[PDB]
Structures are given as C-alpha cells and as structure tokens.
Design a protein around this nucleic acid. Structure first.
Ligand SMILES: Nc1ncnc2c1ncn2[C@@H]1O[C@H](COP(=O)(O)OP(=O)(O)O)[C@@H](O)[C@H]1O
Length: 946
RNA sequence: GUGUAAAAUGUUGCUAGCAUGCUAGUAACGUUUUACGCCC
C-alpha cells in the first residue's frame, strides 16, 4: 500500500527542516516521455540514505511508483513505525488522578478508626398465602379489620341488598347507563354472557379466547358483578383485575367509570405503581399492575372473590410469576375462580399448564383481506433497488434483493430508482392513489420501532410538505413521549379529503383501536429494549417482529370495510421467522423475583421454576442466586435477612434500597429518596424543546458550581416546592420559564414521599428525614451534598466512567462513550470539569454511545465505592474494576478499602435496629463521622491544589 | 442523517510525437487517507 509508512516520515522530514517532495523530472521526447519523481530521506543516526527514483507514466505515477518503492526500502531499513498514522487507541491510563492528597491528620484519624474497630486488612417449608372468603368487619385490600363505622354492626347481606337496590334504581333512572349498556350488549363479548357466567362458577380456572378489539376488558368484570348482585349476594363478592400496563390500567379504569356513570373510587379503583385510589371494601373493583398485586400479596387475598388477570400472551415475566403462583392458589383453594384472558393465541398450552383446564371461545367477526408483498409492489410501483458491538460472526442474509424475476422489471427498477430503507413518496403516493381511485376513506396507520426514527419520519414528512401538507394530509403521531392531548385528538376524526396519517408503535398494536382504520402499513420492526447482565448493557435495538404480531396487524383493520393489508415483507422472511416472540423472562435478571418469592416462604426457587410455564435457563437462576448471596442479602444456607424484607416492600431494585438504608444513617434521607426515585424512573430532566441539541442558558445554569444534573433537579424540585407554597396558575408558567417537565418531577416527589413513609414504617425515626436544602451557586463544601454524591457513586455501580475529551468518555471494560444530549454537561466547546471522573445512570442506544444521568464524582472513591470486593494490586498500582487505575501506596488504599466489612456491618445494624439509627454504637458513630468527613468534594487536594 | 490537502483500480473528450493504432497532459468519481466541529 502507498498510503502508509509515509505520513510521519513527512512529519519527520518537516522536523529535519526539509520541505522537499516528489519533484517531477520529465525524461524523453514527446513520444518516449516518462515522468520521474525524486525524494530523498537522510538518516543521520544510521548514515544509510534512502531515495525514490522510479520512472512513471503520469506525474502522479512518478510519485505513485516512487512513493510505493520509497515505503518498501525504507521499511527494510527497520527504522520507521508502519502506517505512519494516529490510528489505534490505548484507553489512556491515569494521565493524572488526584491520588490521595489528604493531610496526615486524616491518616491518623483513619488509623485510629480502623484500630477503633479492629478490622484486619492485608498490607503487602413451601407454605402458601392465607386466603379467606368475604368476612364481615374486614377489608380485603387494607389487610385489616376496620372495626368502626357501620360494617362493625352490619352484615354483608345488607350490603348486598344495598348494592342490589342501587342497581335497581340505576336501571330505573340512569338513561346514559342504558345507552352504555346497549353499547356493551352490541359488543361481541355480550353474546355468550349466560354461558360464560355459568362456566366461571362451574370452573376454577377459566380461559377466555376472544379476538383483539372485542372490548371484553371493560365488560367481563362488570358482567361478573352484575351477575353476583342480581342474585342478592353481590356484597358477598370482591372482584379483582390486574393489567400489565399502568397507563392502560388508568385508561380502562376511566372507561369503566364513565360506563359506570359514577365517580372513580366508589366501586371501581386503580392501584398503579406509586398510586392508590382504593375503592369501598365490599362489592368493589380494583385495577393494578402485576407489581402492585405482588406487593399486596404479602397479607393474602382474604375476602376477594375472583381474579380476572389481563393479557398473558404479552408473555411478560411478572404475569408468568403471577399465574404460576395463582395455579397453586387454586390448587389449595377450590372456591377461588380465575379468569385467564387472551386475544389471539393457542390457549391450548395455557390450558395444559392448568391440567388441560376448560377454555371458552369468543368468535370474532372479521373480514378476510388480500395481502401485498414484494411481488405486488414491484408490479405496480417497483420494489428492488438500494440507495443511490463492532463485529460478530454467522451469516446475515438480505432477502430484499433475493426475488425471482418472473414478476415485473426487477433489474430495471434497480437500475432506475426507489427508496427502501426510508419510506418515501412511493408508498404514500400508492396509498393516495388507492384512496382517490377505490374511494375508501379510512385511517392510514404505520408502525415504526423507535421514537428516534419516529421523529425522523416526522421531520421527513414535514420538510416534504408537498405530501406532508398537514392542512390536507393530517399527520397524527402516537406515543408515550407526546402528551395525552395528542392521543385524545387522534381518536377524534377529521373530515375526509384531508387524509389521516397516523404513526404509532406496538402501543397501537393493542389497547387503542380506531374504528376508521383501513390502511395498515407494517415493517415488522419493534423496540427490543433488553438488558445484558454479563456486562451491564441496555440495548434499544430493533429486530424482526414476531409472526403472531404480524397476523395481529393483518387482522387489525376491517371494521366495516373488508380491509386492505399492505405488508412490506419478502416471501422468505414472511415464511421464515417464528410465529411467537422469544420469552423475555429468558433474558432478564431474576434477583428481584427471587427475593420476592423468598419473602413469601415458597421454598426453593429451583423447584418453583421447575413448576413454571417455561423453565428459565439454569444460568439465570444461578446469576440471580449469586447476585443475592454475594450482595450479603441472603444467607449462604438460604435464609432471608431482614434487609431483604425491607427491600421487597421497596418498589425499586436493591441497588437503591441497600442505600436507602444508608441515606437515613447519614442524615440525607430526603435527598436519597429523590435520587432513588429519579434514577429508577427513567425520564428526562426538563421539557426539552423540539429541534434542540443542547441545553439553554438556565437549563445549564441550574447545574451551578457543582455542575451536576442530580443537584440541578434537586434544586428545581426545591423551587417547585417553594412555589407550590403559592398558587399553581403562575407556578406552571414559572416552571415552563424554567423549562420544567411537570409530570416527571411530580412523580419523583410522590415517590420520594412514599419512600420516606415506607422508611418510617420500617422503624427509622423521623429526625433523620428532615429538609436538607442545598444551593448550587456556592462552590464551597457542604457535608450533606458530598455524602449524597458518595452514595450516588456506590449506588449506580458499576456505571462509573472516565472523561477523555469533549463528549468522548471511557466506560468500564475498554469501550468509548459519549454524553447524552439532555445531559447538562453537553456543549460545543471544550470545558474541563473540576474532577476527571463521572458516573452515568443509563446507557441508551445499542452501540454504547450515549450515557445518561452524568454527575462528577469525588476522586476518593477508588475502592471506597468502587467494587463489591477489595481490590489489591502490586508495584504501587491500584486496580479499580480492572479498568481504572490509581497511584497510591498499598497501605493507604488497603485501609480506605477495608471499610467494606464496616459498611456491611453498619447496614446490618441499621436493618437490625432501625429505631436507634441516629444513636449508633460509639465506634460505629465515629465510623459514620469519619466517613462523612473524608468524602468531602474538595478533600483529595491537600498539599497540592494543581 | 459528515465532508477535505492524501490511496490504486480504472472511464472520456481533448494537445505533441512515434508508424487507423500507441505513448504523456484530465473537469469528475464509489471502493482504501492522517486528521478536524460530528452521537443523531
Ligand atoms: N374511548 C373508548 N370508548 C369505547 N371503547 C373503548 C375506548 N377505549 C378502549 N375501548 C375498548 O377497550 C377494549 C380494550 O380491551 P382489549 O384490548 O380487547 O383487551 P386487553 O386489554 O386484554 O388487550 C378495546 O377493545 C376497545 O374496544
């Protein structure tokens, strides 16, 4: 090669005060002319001159031949480095840390602390939950007897009579209830009401199979309660439904409440995560997520009649756990009746789990449709051409170009034009001419995997305003990012002539459905938001959608029109991929489920997973078991610690509960609730504007001298509190002027309140939960905030990172990374932060480019909060997770890291005796004091500022 | 949803000699360039 072994040589020649290059010297007459280049390199060290003198056709070829030869012999000199470039990287080592730089007073304090605690270091069976039928003077959701009011002296039969007469009066007067009820009767589920209501009483486990859009979600529970109350015993019945999506649960609660024509919370209520509107104790309806039911499971289902668990072919792990537990529930308890619910799937396997349990059928009216593939679209509008980690193995095969040319002009279209990867005017014009010729006014729906490409298609339609003309081509997006106003507007149709273009994702595959849908466009692409435990990676990838989802989309439309299915897939792919989707419970950490089951004293996890729908691979249970045991939360002989009992009630992963323990130990509990709530709830920092690549003046100013997003959101919540002390009307305007996002931080506040309340019931006294307001504008040192930063460092582990330059940062295990756009440390110029160490919250995007929730960390962590186990190395080098280096003599690192037993003993004492957390044992008290002292932000700089 | 002084395959038109051909002088171009604000 000629573009190598010469660039640094030219630089070396420049250092030799030589500006010479390949000088072209013509040789021969105009018929025997040849071009000769000259370039000589002298090496004084070796005194072996090298030169390039080779004839060449063209002036470049004079240099082209000479330079190639010049590389050849000068490389034979064995003096130059090959490729002569700035290529290759080394993950630059500890160019400079702030190694220790503490006063000897701190050294003496640490020595007397470790000698004050004497911690040596080297210096070189299957039970079940209780259940009862409805019982008087007892509430089934609050797990207690009210013993007051009216029920203490009133029988449940009187409650049933009251509910029955209320229903009778409603039938007498409530006319909008009448219209809602023929709306429910004309709904297809109502056809087999009598047989389903008889079978549910006749059968313990009932599986209902009714196609998507049948609307049984809003009606099965209502029918059950009506049947129970028309018999005069509705009061002697509490009905229960869960559902795997919080917003869907809220929507169905609203739908049943409006159909009930009654205020929410009287008979129907919803308990989504971090919220509760619990209804009346008897003859009531509750909706919830699976996690909420798992939390309520501790007391038992005593007093509830039936459970009507929603979607199962979602195949989520929590629903699988719920169903596995509920099978044993009904095996032990015969009176309980269970309703399994699905839309379109082979319920034979689900019945097989329940000993071939009876499965009931709800036939659904549908119109068969024709389907289009590469052949039809190549026939009328062409379909062939292309656009005119880092590596693995195996063999990806692309079937887009693989199609027999017995159809229309494959190669001719290839040579001429189209756009495939990004849908363009071809498909939209095909559907437009379809509308204008077939005269079929219907909604146009397109399903796209990722919100980033959602915005890309929005911008591609907007800039192409000729066919993105909103005034005549209505464009209607649909996702969780956009507010509920747009979702409400989507369900509101607009007059035909102004075509309705709707873009959404797997959220529109279920839950929501428009009666005007005719045009279905599919790309079989969906979000692949998964996690990898072996290296702590979250990938928001996109893989071919499950076939079952493909026929679900195929049957999505066709309300009154027969329906027209436009499939963007090839034959081989359409007949190749599997019908269902891979079980998400196969690739998901089981530590949370393992802790949950181990609190319910349900015996060995291995036996449980053996008696499950799908046995998880043994590596999953092994990794969950080791992640619990080596986290010092489950005893080596499989005995549950009170710490795990605390964790289970916490609706957060143990990586935050373990240290919600410690936050109250250090008197920073409110800030810890804030950080845990915001870290667990993956959301934004502000109401970012559209088309924005950085943060505004105040969006960066709220970071302040600390320059942390965490402290920025903390202070933002602080001003929001001091402004909600005033009215909300101007508060909303002020927060918008601050760019605040309302709902996200409101949820953060509610979660902080719930966490502090739960820590109250844990036994921890209130004084350690007090306000700890911190102002970002001061660059000095406040103990509370640096303690907070240290706990952030220990918490998000192992999400630490090293900043290199600009956005380029280095993360664990030899991977480059950049900063998130929303992160407050984003900019265009080079700004050197006070400390060259950061920690991130989440790693969005597949190729580990964007790190989320960045906050700089004190250099004193190293081993303080840098690993689960002590890391000791040799030759005066400190090993931090085998990817970070510090230069400390072994003894100081040894003593700063030997407090891992100290901290775990502190946590053990705190969970053992929550009542005296403020008044700790005196050696432990001075441990707390000294660790508060050492973790100051500006601590590792004594003796030498820079 | 990056491009530049650098790498070679190679097309044209077109200027002079060597006896309709051959040789040098290229607007331009993927694919391989040191690097620079670049994370979508
Ligand atoms: N605003 C609304 N008005 C009337 N019906 C609605 C409304 N929103 C949702 N629905 C009905 O609620 C039903 C949801 O139940 P479905 O999705 O079939 O069960 P699952 O939630 O288990 O998938 C839909 O079929 C739809 O007809």
């Amino acid at each position: 090669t000629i573009e190598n072994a010469k660039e640094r040589l030219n630089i070396y020649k420049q250092t030799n005060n030589i500006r010479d290059d390949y000088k072209y010297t013509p040789v021969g007459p105009e018929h025997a002319r040849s071009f000769l280049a000259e370039l000589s390199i002298y090496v004084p060290a070796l005194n072996r001159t090298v030169t390039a003198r080779e004839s060449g056709s063209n002036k470049k070829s004079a240099s082209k031949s000479c330079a190639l030869s010049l590389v050849r012999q000068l490389f034979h000199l064995n003096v130059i480095e090959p490729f002569s470039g700035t290529l290759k990287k080394k993950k630059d080592e500890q160019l400079k840390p702030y190694p220790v730089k503490l006063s000897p007073n701190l050294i003496n304090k640490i020595d007397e602390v470790i000698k004050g605690l004497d911690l040596p270091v080297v210096n070189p069976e299957s039970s079940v939950i209780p259940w009862a039928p409805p019982q008087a003077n007892w509430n089934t959701w609050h797990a207690c007897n009210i013993d007051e009011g009216e029920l203490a002296t009133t029988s449940i039969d009187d409650l049933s009579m009251d509910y029955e007469r209320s229903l009778r009066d409603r039938r007498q007067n409530d006319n909008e209830y009448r219209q809602f009820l023929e709306f429910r009767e004309k709904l297809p589920i109502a056809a087999m009401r009598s047989e389903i209501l008889t079978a549910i009483n006749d059968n313990p486990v009932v599986i209902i199979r009714g196609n998507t859009g049948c609307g049984k979600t809003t009606q099965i529970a209502q029918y059950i309660l009506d049947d129970y109350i028309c018999s005069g015993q509705g009061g002697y019945a509490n009905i229960y439904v869960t559902q795997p999506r919080r917003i869907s649960a809220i929507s169905v609660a609203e739908r049943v409440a409006r159909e009930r024509c009654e205020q929410l919370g009287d008979t129907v209520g919803y308990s989504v995560r971090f919220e509760s509107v619990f209804p009346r104790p008897y003859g009531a309806i509750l909706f919830c997520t699976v996690g909420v039911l798992l939390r309520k499971l501790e007391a038992g289902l005593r007093g509830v009649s039936h459970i009507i668990v929603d979607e199962i072919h979602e195949r989520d792990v929590n629903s699988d756990f719920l169903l596995v537990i509920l099978r044993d529930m009904v095996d032990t308890y015969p009176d309980l009746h269970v309703i399994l619910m699905s839309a379109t799937i082979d319920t034979t396997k689900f019945s097989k789990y329940f000993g071939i349990c009876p499965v009931l059928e709800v036939p659904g009216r549908a119109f068969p449709v024709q389907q289009f593939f590469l052949e039809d679209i190549i026939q009328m509008t062409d379909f062939v051409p292309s656009a005119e980690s880092e590596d693995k193995d195996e063999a990806e095969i692309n079937y887009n170009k693989v199609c027999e040319d017995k159809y229309s002009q494959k190669t001719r279209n290839a040579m001429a034009m189209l756009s495939e990867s990004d849908v363009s005017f071809e498909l939209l014009e095909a559907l437009l001419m379809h509308i204008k010729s077939k005269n079929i006014p219907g909604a146009i729906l397109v399903f796209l995997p990722g919100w980033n490409l959602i915005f890309a298609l929005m911008k591609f339609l907007q800039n192409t305003n000729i066919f993105g003309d909103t005034s005549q081509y209505q464009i209607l997006p649909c996702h969780s990012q956009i507010p509920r106003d747009e979702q409400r507007k989507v369900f509101e149709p607009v007059p035909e002539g102004v075509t309705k273009i709707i873009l959404s994702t797997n959220i529109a595959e279920t839950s929501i459905t428009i009666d005007d849908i005719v045009f279905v466009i599919d790309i079989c692409k969906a979000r692949m938001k998964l996690f990898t435990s072996h290296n702590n990676l979250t990938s928001y990838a996109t893989v071919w959608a499950s076939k079952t989802n493909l026929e679900q989309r195929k049957g999505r439309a066709g309300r009154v029109r027969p329906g027209f299915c436009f499939t963007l897939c090839s034959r081989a792919r359409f007949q190749a991929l599997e019908d269902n989707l891979t079980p998400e419970m196969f690739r998901t950490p089981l530590h949370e489920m393992a802790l949950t089951i181990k609190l319910l004293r349900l015996g060995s996890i291995h036996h449980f997973l053996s008696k499950a729908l799908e046995p998880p691979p043994v590596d999953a249970v092994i990794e969950a078991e080791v992640l619990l045991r080596e986290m010092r939360c489950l005893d080596a002989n499989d005995e549950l610690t009170p710490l795990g009992r605390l964790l289970a009630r916490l609706p957060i992963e143990p990586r935050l509960g373990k240290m919600m323990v410690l936050g109250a130990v250090f008197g920073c509990a409110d800030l810890m609730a804030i950080m845990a709530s915001y870290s667990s709830t993956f959301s934004e920092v502000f109401s970012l504007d559209i088309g924005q690549r950085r943060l505004a003046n105040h969006q960066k100013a709220l970071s302040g001298t600390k320059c942390s997003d965490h402290v920025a959101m903390i202070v933002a919540s602080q001003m929001w509190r001091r402004e909600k002390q005033r009215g909300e009307h101007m508060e909303a305007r002020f927060c918008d002027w601050k760019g605040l996002q309302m709902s996200t931080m409101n949820v953060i506040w509610d979660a902080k309140q719930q966490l502090l309340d739960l820590l109250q019931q844990a036994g921890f006294p209130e004084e350690c939960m007090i306000s700890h307001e911190v102002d970002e504008r001061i660059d000095g040192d406040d103990p509370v905030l640096d303690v907070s930063l240290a706990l952030l460092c220990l918490g998000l582990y192992p999400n630490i990172c090293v900043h290199k330059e600009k956005r380029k940062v280095l993360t664990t295990e030899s991977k480059a990374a950049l900063l998130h756009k929303t992160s407050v440390n984003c900019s265009n110029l080079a700004v050197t932060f006070p400390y060259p160490f950061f920690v991130f919250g989440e790693k969005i995007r597949t190729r580990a480019v964007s790190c989320k929730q960045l906050s700089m960390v004190s250099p004193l962590q190293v081993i303080l909060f840098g690993s689960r186990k002590i890391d000791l190395a040799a030759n005066n080098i400190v090993r931090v997770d085998n990817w970070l280096n510090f230069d400390i003599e072994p003894e100081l690192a040894a003593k700063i890291g030997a407090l891992k037993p100290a901290l775990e003993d502190l946590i053990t004492v705190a969970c053992d005796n929550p009542s005296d957390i403020l008044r700790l044992e005196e050696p432990y008290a001075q441990l707390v004091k000294v660790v508060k002292d050492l973790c100051v932000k500006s601590a590792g700089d004594f003796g030498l500022q820079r």
